[PDB]
Enzyme design. Sequence first.
Site, PDB file in Angstrom:
ATOM      1  N   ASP A 159      -6.863 -79.998  24.786  1.00  0.00           N
ATOM      2  CA  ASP A 159      -5.969 -79.565  23.718  1.00  0.00           C
ATOM      3  C   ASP A 159      -6.589 -78.525  22.790  1.00  0.00           C
ATOM      4  O   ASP A 159      -6.485 -78.626  21.564  1.00  0.00           O
ATOM      5  CB  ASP A 159      -5.484 -80.762  22.891  1.00  0.00           C
ATOM      6  CG  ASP A 159      -4.220 -80.449  22.094  1.00  0.00           C
ATOM      7  OD1 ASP A 159      -3.723 -81.345  21.378  1.00  0.00           O
ATOM      8  OD2 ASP A 159      -3.715 -79.303  22.178  1.00  0.00           O
ATOM      9  N   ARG A 163      -5.247 -74.752  15.654  1.00  0.00           N
ATOM     10  CA  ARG A 163      -5.011 -75.882  14.743  1.00  0.00           C
ATOM     11  C   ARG A 163      -6.055 -76.979  14.973  1.00  0.00           C
ATOM     12  O   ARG A 163      -6.274 -77.823  14.110  1.00  0.00           O
ATOM     13  CB  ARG A 163      -3.611 -76.487  14.967  1.00  0.00           C
ATOM     14  CG  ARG A 163      -3.412 -77.054  16.390  1.00  0.00           C
ATOM     15  CD  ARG A 163      -2.130 -77.885  16.575  1.00  0.00           C
ATOM     16  NE  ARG A 163      -2.023 -78.387  17.953  1.00  0.00           N
ATOM     17  CZ  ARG A 163      -1.572 -77.672  18.987  1.00  0.00           C
ATOM     18  NH1 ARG A 163      -1.164 -76.416  18.813  1.00  0.00           N
ATOM     19  NH2 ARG A 163      -1.557 -78.199  20.206  1.00  0.00           N
TER      20      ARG A 163
END
Length: 301
Positions: A159, A163
């Site tokens: 992932d 962010r």
Amino acid sequence: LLQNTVHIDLSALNPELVQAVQHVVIGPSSLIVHFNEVIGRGHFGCVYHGTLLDNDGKKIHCAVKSLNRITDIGEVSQFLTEGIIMKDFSHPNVLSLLGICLRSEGSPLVVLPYMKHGDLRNFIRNETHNPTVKDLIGFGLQVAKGMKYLASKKFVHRDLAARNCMLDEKFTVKVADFGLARDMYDKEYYSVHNKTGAKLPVKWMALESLQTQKFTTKSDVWSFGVLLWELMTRGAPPYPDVNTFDITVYLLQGRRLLQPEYCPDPLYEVMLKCWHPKAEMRPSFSELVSRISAIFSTFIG
């Protein structure tokens, strides 16, 4: 033999694992959690400001994540294993783990380094906007170095995104959202392969992952590329254009995120190679740091 876990029953686990986690455990006395002070944007309800007292006086500002009690034997072993792994990792661009504070029949506490400037995506989006294009490229170089280290440890992130990286007080970037820092707005701990139904980061996923849901360091490379795109656009959403359900067809056609303005051409080239349809043809993270570094050093354009 079990100096920090002597009071809790971990007999169901492998004894080698249990003594191996000993050095990751922090004693309750050494940690003061400020429960009325939540970290950053309050986007993670279970993470608070803490003060960790170490060896000597050593008072350390930290971020403490509180998790629900883990009652499944398999998940507890996964939890501790990830703790050991993260704890033993050591690299300037990789979020470290200070330790875990364990109590009997209760909520485990993940103790992490405090990151003064929050996540990278939000940082490049507000007005402490001192970063120039060269700085942006610099951030990307740091992420690459972090990923290179992770890859050399055969650790697949799954992932990677702007962010999910943090910045400390000296603006050093740290790859996060992995190990015990993974999914921080979730009070429940979930093993990597035990969170069926989880939302996937579709617009950051490699073509082969979108179709098989298997991730590798090569798919992390594809993600790094989008991460790079985010940087050069100062936090723009990728593909605001296409619906998540149309992303796979979009990419299968050969379409890709467009080169943002001011993004030097050789950098965009790096992005395109990261998005190569054949995973084996994408650059490794080692090569990534080499090219980015070269680009970064000979620029101020």
